[PDB]
Amino acid sequence: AGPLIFVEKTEPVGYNEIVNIKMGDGTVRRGQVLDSSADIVVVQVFEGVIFTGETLKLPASVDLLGRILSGSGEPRDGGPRIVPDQLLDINGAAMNPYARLPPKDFIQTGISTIDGTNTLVRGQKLPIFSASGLPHAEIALQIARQASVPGSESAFAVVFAAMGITNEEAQYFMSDFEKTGALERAVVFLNLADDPAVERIVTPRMALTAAEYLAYEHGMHVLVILTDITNYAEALRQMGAARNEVPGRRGYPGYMYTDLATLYERAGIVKGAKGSVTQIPILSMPGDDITHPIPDLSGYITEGQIVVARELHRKGIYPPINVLPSLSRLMNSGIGAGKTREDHKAVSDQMYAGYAEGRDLRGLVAIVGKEALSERDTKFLEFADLFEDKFVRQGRNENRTIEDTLEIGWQILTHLPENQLGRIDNKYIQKYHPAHR
Amino acid sequence: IAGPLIFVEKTEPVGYNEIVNIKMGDGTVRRGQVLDSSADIVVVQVFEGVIFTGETLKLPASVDLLGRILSGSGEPRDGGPRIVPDQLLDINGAAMNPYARLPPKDFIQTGISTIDGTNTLVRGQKLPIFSASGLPHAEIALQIARQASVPGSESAFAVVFAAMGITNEEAQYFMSDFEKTGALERAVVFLNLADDPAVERIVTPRMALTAAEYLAYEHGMHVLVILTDITNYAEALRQMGYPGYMYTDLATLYERAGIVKGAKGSVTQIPILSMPGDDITHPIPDLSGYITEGQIVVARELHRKGIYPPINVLPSLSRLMNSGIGAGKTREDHKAVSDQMYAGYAEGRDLRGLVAIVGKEALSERDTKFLEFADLFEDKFVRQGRNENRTIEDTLEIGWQILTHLPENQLGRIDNKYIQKYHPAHRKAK
Ligand SMILES: NCCc1ccc(S(=O)(=O)F)cc1
Ligand SMILES: [Cl-]
């Protein structure tokens, strides 16, 4: 009748078995079993002799940082089990950590097509929208390695959670975190394709609980990277009461309509305002809607999105992010004097407009021929190439500061006639344009 | 297959890979190579007396295109006579540049609240409908074709409706709907059937856009072009993953929008971008080139819940909305009401998550109001009849009514001046 909770399995259980559960806060719930792995039971609680169990707990400690764990929080790094400061329920009920404050202030990802044009702010949920065969995992990993909060008095941490991945992918992520030293400031949760589906379902909840704990109890800005929500959804649609039931039809369980919202609700500035939880969920377009209907991923898209584009990938460009369909709705809260730089908005606006114009002119060029294009139009056409070649394109290991990003922006903007810079205040042209300054 | 596609009248027999000249609207010629052909239309890939010099494929242009149903090649499909042209216009877009260097602006009333209210369509904009297999994007497209208008515009309004690769049953349905509602009288309708030559499918949006340019520029009209659907267009390129040149080819479609020279007309596009239900047989194309001014998102969640039209405003966006709203265009309170409904709906939807974490009875009284607001938004604002044509006033007033469910002190996005003037609890009866 109510919330799904996650319980430590201590004996075999049957479908719809009535159970009593001891919660993290010491209270008890009664509920019904939906599904189970070897170690975990999924229980749907009721409001207000049988099996008595305890909830599955995150072993919460600052010593989570530097560790690589399974989806259930068990070590994968050869290290000892986490010694907990606190044992926390994982479904979101623990801590009540979120403030009623808007997201704000800069997270530097080091990727120009995010920081420059679609800025990530602390407390935001900003999905990466992608598809099979595109390098969204590479982008996610690069952000994990590079992200920081310039000028903040609060410490920064990363929670990286990968779901449904292959053995070789897991080995790769582990090696990357270890060799780069990104592991020092990260908690890494790795769920394998062949791990139990219930473990996959618990994975983002373990990750979000760790993030909330570090943000709220330790005053950290925490960035949570979740790759891939689509993979999570493929497990969900075959778990418990959803098994062989069809979305929108009789028999499809109500919790399937709100499950994704239990994940996307969990982001924001935390109480005290010294910390925050920011999410970058990867949403890969599944390709199999007809055979594998999943919960609508649109619910996760309320504060913008970063779009990975096959066009740019096929051009040989990494990261292949198309800024034009990309958006950060909270960008203005994270940029400008004292955050990035005063000319940030102006430079972003002008690059966006110039790139959009240049891309339209690729069409016009095809319609009339290169020789028929005006000199002014040719400059914008060329600007779109410069934008893709110099601004969009950056190394896998290239961590650009926002100043680096804005400088590249100004350099490519010099290709346009100064009189065509309609989105940039004259004050910023005089102060920052390379032909001046 | 590298160069851009140009369409040429079949006036003489041609062969594959034959090198040809194409005569352009200004008397110059471009050189190309024959890629493919139907009986009447040659597809040339362009580069950079002795050889074939071809004429561009032409639209027979006249105001009498209005009220007609044509094929993708412009031939009558309505039993009527062939169009008698005032002009023969190159459909490749090259003989005439009607577009002004002006930003899109001013209101197009679709009559659909989740467009007009929260992500307003403006004249000259390209605003795709982003949808997927099994969703009612075609119903939405037809509803917009029936309902759209430009309130208070001195310029007359027309619709160009182009459907690509459709079944005979869909064709009959579209024709019937245009005819019986009278929507046909202000429209030029281009219907390309699935079994029509693939060449005619790729010519279809170019015929449509040429018709819209002619009406907009030569007759001072605001023209709304509805193109359904681009995924099917992309598949025709495939049967002629996707070819590399597709991205440039799409730009030849999406460049063709905006206010026209003189600013008494415009070409606005609503392309339908539908994601295939089966990746294996119908690969997912990168149509993101078309998405530069926002998107209207058709959502499975809302469709599953039995709501029409199933538009989720939160991922939807109109980048140019501010240029189409307010005093003299819609109403002064538009931006505030939109901002507040968006914020309230987003908060309510997050609170659906919280309910599924802590249980409904654990929510605060305040949070419960926002939770209930999300239900009201979906049931009263999102939901509307297939033939329910809402004025912007109607949609703003629905908005105000549902906003009364929230505590007045929680209306952070609304200027006190608009609360005093328009909030049902304060507004004076006049
Ligand atoms: N197989 C279709 C290709 C084609 C079809 C027709 C011609 S033509 O007769 O009009 F010259 C040329 C090439
Ligand atoms: Cl859903």
UniProtKB/Swiss-Prot annotation, chain A:
Coiled-coil intervals, chain numbering: none
Entry-linked CDD domains: ATP-synt_V_A-type_beta_C, ATP-synt_V_A-type_beta_N, V_A-ATPase_B
Membrane topology: Peripheral membrane protein
Annotated PROSITE patterns: ATPASE_ALPHA_BETA
Keywords: ATP synthesis, Cell membrane, Hydrogen ion transport, Ion transport, Membrane, Transport
GO annotations of cellular component type: plasma membrane; proton-transporting two-sector ATPase complex, catalytic domain
Effect of pH on activity: Optimum pH is 5.2 for ATP hydrolysis.
Main location: membrane
Cited InterPro entries: ATP-synt_VA_C (IPR055190), ATPase_a/bsu_AS (IPR020003), ATPase_A1-cplx_bsu (IPR005724), ATPase_F1/V1/A1_a/bsu_N (IPR004100), ATPase_F1/V1/A1_a/bsu_nucl-bd (IPR000194), P-loop_NTPase (IPR027417), V-ATPase_su_B/beta (IPR022879)
Sample GO molecular function, one term: proton-transporting ATP synthase activity, rotational mechanism
Annotated localization: Cell membrane
Gene3D superfamilies per the UniProt record, alphabetical: 3.40.50.12240
PANTHER family linked to this entry: V-TYPE PROTON ATPASE SUBUNIT B
NCBIfam families: ATP_syn_B_arch (TIGR01041), PRK04196.1 (NF003235)
Function: Component of the A-type ATP synthase that produces ATP from ADP in the presence of a proton gradient across the membrane. The B chain is a regulatory subunit.
HAMAP family in UniProt: ATP_synth_B_arch
Subunit structure: Has multiple subunits, A(3), B(3), C, D, E, F, G, I and K(x); there may be a few other subunits as well.
Similarity remark: Belongs to the ATPase alpha/beta chains family.
Identification of the protein by name: A-type ATP synthase subunit B
